[PDB]
Design a protein around this nucleic acid. Structure first.
Ligand code: EFZ
Ligand code: CA
Ligand code: CA
Lengths: 404, 545
RNA sequence: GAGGCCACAAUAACUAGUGGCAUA
DNA sequence: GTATGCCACTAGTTATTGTGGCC
């Protein structure tokens, strides 16, 4: 079968991304995988006149602990975004977020047998590095649609629906959504009947879980105290004052009114009636779904994460600062372990609800993250990410979120 | 025969049309002889009017391809990083073969040849000159190293497959060949390699002409079983220029890979700011001391050993003070594979546990580059000091494999702030203010016991006054104190207990906090009518706003 | 035809984002 | 009223100089 032509935008150059250094055990694992992929025609060795490059990694498989190859096409995906979103975009069903159970299925090997436009193959170049720069570096390029390129599901889309039209008529209230190399299968059935309803699909493809409505935003719960000190009120005011950037009806005027004069931090302050009322109004604003926050499809999603201690992490998903479309907590290892699981959890939620992955703001140094993230990565996509500090008030605020 | 590599010009570009300047009759005579011979061997060919390109003959690389190079496509670049010697493995027998006719042995892509045209001018320059183009990779052309290396890799692959146990490293025009064979069997393998290469026209020195170890390579001296750096001479001068000092820091940084404990921070300070290269710079006595120690380090001979892949790597770090750390990597005690240093060049208030964790991250990355695996660390810090710092810190990290080693100076937290306000201790509300225009500022406190103080400062900032204010509260309080500030800057510096930094104010503050026995420190937002904060704010902003 | 090329380091410059302060 | 500066944290970039090399 012939290939769909693909082109970068006229000013665009191909990806020239530097390969991060790999451990010897991952280099050896990648040499095996690639010589097997070459023996099957899926990749070919390339010469030095190809200047492009994309990073390659080794991650462990979901099922087995055998090694798996991850090519980080984030840069190529950005450079081909007209192709895989406008020209051949895949629509996202708003019903998927409402199923009781959603299953994730790996349909990655489907692309292995569709050829890639010859004029585009040079842009898929990657390099298996060597220890200590002792040998030049083994260069390949793709002959078939690559896993991890967002062009692959778009190109394979008309083939994909033809495979699924039978299963969709038979089961007409099951939603199938595909994002990159994954199938998201949503059903309101119960668990035992759901797991059989996917095996019928797992056989239909072979011939050729998530609980979204359990995802629930928790309210902020303020301290309840029988006796308030100056210190307690000062701490509460700093948090509520900051939080008014989220909830504009929050007020601290009556609480600040109680802190008259140069008081000792442990002095007890009885709450006047005006104070108790401001506080009670504040509690009500907080245990009510925030308003004026609505998803904008023309904007990037952003996920921020705070380290809370004792293996606890809070996160927010937003597009404009303080306008959180979603917030939550992730509970338990090491920091990088937990942080990589949080990122994959949040990205999966974000794929189901909006069909996009968010750009992550991570509270870790870049170089530590780049050294260790593949030690626990199991996904086939890689979200964009950057590295930030955490302001103390941010952490202190989302620490108040009610535990589920 | 060696097959050509297709090479293109950059999109939208034509080839060079650079005019050739006239030359002396002596230069033309020598060029004619050189080119007549190159033409006989088939490396260049005479061309005529059909070719519109030109590149100047090199004026003291026969030809200067700077323009062609700008117009040539990019390549996957060859030998980006060099091996580090500590990543090599010990070998019984080692050989280096320099390939004599390397570029001359590789044909140039036929449709690219026309862009390499050049002219030998006539002596009168009233008659046209002799024009040529290259048939092989030209010396100096951007593409030749990457194409030659790629050709050499395909040539070497059959030989490597039949000789799994022989290491061949290709470096420019040289092959380094290592084996564990006794020298007699090694030399038999060397000659087979020479024969393999000669079938493609690649010539190499015979046994009588091959160099014997040690090999000089990239400033290293490589032995079969060890490596060192070639000698390191530090000039002895009474007066130092900026350029002299730059030369020192480069030699000292080069030495620090094998000479342990090198330090440069005090010499680096002397290079800050404007400075013409000739300006003589007076050496600080701290510089003079550190230069002194470095001279004593470099008096003793040292060497590195090679990597035994069957043993664990071990990295050990020592604090050298003032933000400087030093490390050694070995697999057997007292036999370093390499050493290095780590310095936080920005004069920040980094915590010592945090500086140490960056040293570890630097060493971990370097160790994956050189050996393909991470070492086990021995760190001058107890497991509980490390645990309390990181579980109290907003940032994630992870050091997978380390252990305490009791070699001082140990890393330890100097004080711990309270998490709850102290009963019966005086509450200080502190504040500062400054004008940007005049650099005039004030710092002070007011107290629940009725006390208060304001001090006026010159050549100061909003940031320093907030620290000054905390200085004052600490200075005039008892051994237990609650302090309330609106500067998250000043609070973060204190919570992130700095090492001895450059700011004398911060060191003074850290000293005061050691001597205290209970300090609770709290933040409140400014301009909210919070009592205490409001009174002191009125005090320090009087002659300022 | 005033030299380029690689790694590393230092310096200078442009820094940008987040955060409390602070200007207006 | 959106812009500025001061410095902690986070992330860079193009230039110079130096060390060790290569043309
Ligand atoms: O792995 C090893 N071990 C080793 C030990 C001593 C010597 Cl002198 C040389 C080597 C070698 C190399 C090389 C170039 C980077 C100089 C060799 F290629 F084998 F020669 O690499
Ligand atoms: Ca202040
Ligand atoms: Ca003030």
């Amino acid at each position: 079968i012939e290939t769909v032509p693909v082109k970068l935008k006229p000013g665009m150059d191909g990806p020239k991304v530097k390969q991060w250094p790999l451990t010897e055990e991952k280099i050896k694992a990648l040499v095996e995988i690639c010589t097997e992929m070459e023996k099957e025609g899926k990749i070919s060795k390339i010469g030095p006149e190809n200047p492009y490059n994309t990073p390659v990694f080794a991650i462990k498989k979901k099922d087995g602990t055998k090694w798996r190859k991850l090519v980080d096409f984030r840069e190529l995906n950005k450079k081909t975004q007209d192709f895989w979103e406008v020209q051949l975009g895949i629509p996202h069903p708003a019903g998927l977020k409402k199923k009781k159970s959603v299953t994730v299925l790996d349909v990655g090997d489907a692309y292995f047998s569709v050829p890639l436009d010859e004029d585009f193959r040079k842009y898929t170049a990657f390099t298996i590095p060597s220890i200590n720069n002792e040998t030049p570096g083994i260069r390949y390029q793709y002959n078939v649609l690559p896993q991890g390129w967002k062009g692959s599901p778009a190109i394979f889309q008309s083939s994909m629906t033809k495979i699924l039209e039978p299963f969709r008529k038979q089961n007409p209230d099951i939603v199938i959504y595909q994002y990159m190399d994954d199938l998201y299968v949503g059903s309101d059935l119960e668990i035992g009947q759901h797991r059989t309803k996917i095996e019928e699909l797992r056989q239909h493809l072979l011939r050729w879980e998530l609980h979204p409505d359990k995802w629930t935003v928790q309210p902020i719960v303020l301290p309840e105290k029988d006796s308030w000190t100056v210190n307690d009120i000062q701490k509460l005011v700093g948090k509520l004052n900051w939080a008014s950037q989220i909830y504009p009806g929050i007020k601290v005027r009556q609480l600040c009114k109680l802190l008259r004069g140069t008081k000792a931090l442990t002095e007890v302050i009885p709450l006047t009636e005006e104070a108790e009322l401001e506080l009670a109004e504040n509690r009500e604003i907080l245990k009510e779904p925030v308003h004026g926050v609505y998803y904008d499809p023309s904007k990037d999603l952003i996920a921020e994460i705070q380290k809370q201690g004792q293996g606890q992490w809070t996160y927010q998903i937003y597009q404009e600062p303080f306008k959180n479309l979603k917030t939550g907590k992730y509970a338990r290892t090491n920091d990088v372990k937990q942080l990589t699981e949080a990122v994959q959890k949040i990205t999966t939620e974000s794929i189901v609800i909006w069909g996009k992955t968010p750009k992550f703001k991570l509270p870790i140094q870049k170089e530590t993250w780049e050294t260790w993230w593949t030690e626990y990565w199991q996904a086939t996509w890689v979200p964009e990410w950057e590295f930030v500090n955490t302001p103390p008030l941010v952490k202190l605020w989302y620490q108040l979120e009610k535990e589920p | 025969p060696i097959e050509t590599v297709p090479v293109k010009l950059k999109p939208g570009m034509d080839g060079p049309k650079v005019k050739q300047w006239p030359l002396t009759e002596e230069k033309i005579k020598a060029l004619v002889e050189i080119c007549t011979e190159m033409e006989k061997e088939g490396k260049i060919s005479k061309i005529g009017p059909e070719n519109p390109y030109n590149t100047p003959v090199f004026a003291i690389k026969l030809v200067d391809f700077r323009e062609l190079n700008k117009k040539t496509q990019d390549f996957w670049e060859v030998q980006l990083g060099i091996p580090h010697p500590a990543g090599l493995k010990k070998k019984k027998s080692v050989t280096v073969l320099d390939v004599g006719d390397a570029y001359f042995s590789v044909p140039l892509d036929e449709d690219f040849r026309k862009y390499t045209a050049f002219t030998i001018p006539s002596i009168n320059n009233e008659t046209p000159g002799i024009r040529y183009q290259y048939n092989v990779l030209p010396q100096g052309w951007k593409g030749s190293p990457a194409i030659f290396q790629s050709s050499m890799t395909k040539i070497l692959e059959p030989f490597r497959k039949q000789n799994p146990d022989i290491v061949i490293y290709q470096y420019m025009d040289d092959l380094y060949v290592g084996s564990d064979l006794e020298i007699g069997q090694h030399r038999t393998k060397i000659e087979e390699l020479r024969q393999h290469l000669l079938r493609w026209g690649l010539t190499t020195p015979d046994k009588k002409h091959q160099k014997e170890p040690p090999f000089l390579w990239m400033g290293y001296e490589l032995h079969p079983d060890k490596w060192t750096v070639q000698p390191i001479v530090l000039p002895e001068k009474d007066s130092w220029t900026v350029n002299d000092i730059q030369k020192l820091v480069g030699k000292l940084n080069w030495a620090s890979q094998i000479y342990p404990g090198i330090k440069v921070r005090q010499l680096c300070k002397l290079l800050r700011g404007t400075k013409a290269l000739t300006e003589v710079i007076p050496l600080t006595e701290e510089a003079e001391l550190e230069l002194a120690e470095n001279r004593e380090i470099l008096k003793e001979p040292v060497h590195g050993v090679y990597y035994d892949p069957s043993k664990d790597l071990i990295a050990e770090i020592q604090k050298q003070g003032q933000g400087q750390w030093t490390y050694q990597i070995y697999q057997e005690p007292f036999k370093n594979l390499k050493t290095g240093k780590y310095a936080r060049m920005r004069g920040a208030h980094t915590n010592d546990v945090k500086q140490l964790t960056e040293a570890v991250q630097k060493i971990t990355t370097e160790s994956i580059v050189i050996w393909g695996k991470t070492p086990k660390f021995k760190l001058p810090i107890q497991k509980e000091t490390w645990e309390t710092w990181w579980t109290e810190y907003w940032q994630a990290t992870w050091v997978p494999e380390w252990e305490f080693v009791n070699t001082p100076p140990l890393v330890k937290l100097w004080y711990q702030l309270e998490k709850e306000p102290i009963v019966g201790a005086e509450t200080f509300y502190v504040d500062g203010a400054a004008s940007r225009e005049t650099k005039l500022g004030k710092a002070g406190y007011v107290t629940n016991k009725g006390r208060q103080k304001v001090v006026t400062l010159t050549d100061t900032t909003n940031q320093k006054t907030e620290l000054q204010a905390i200085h004052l509260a600490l200075q005039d309080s008892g051994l237990e104190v609650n302090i309330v500030t609106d500067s998250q800057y000043a609070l973060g510096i204190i919570q992130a207990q700095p090492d001895q930094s450059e700011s004398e104010l911060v060191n003074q503050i850290i000293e005061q906090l050691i001597k205290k026995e209970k300090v609770y420190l709290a933040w409140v937002p400014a301009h909210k009518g919070i009592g205490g904060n409001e009174q002191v704010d009125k005090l320090v902003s009087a002659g300022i706003r």
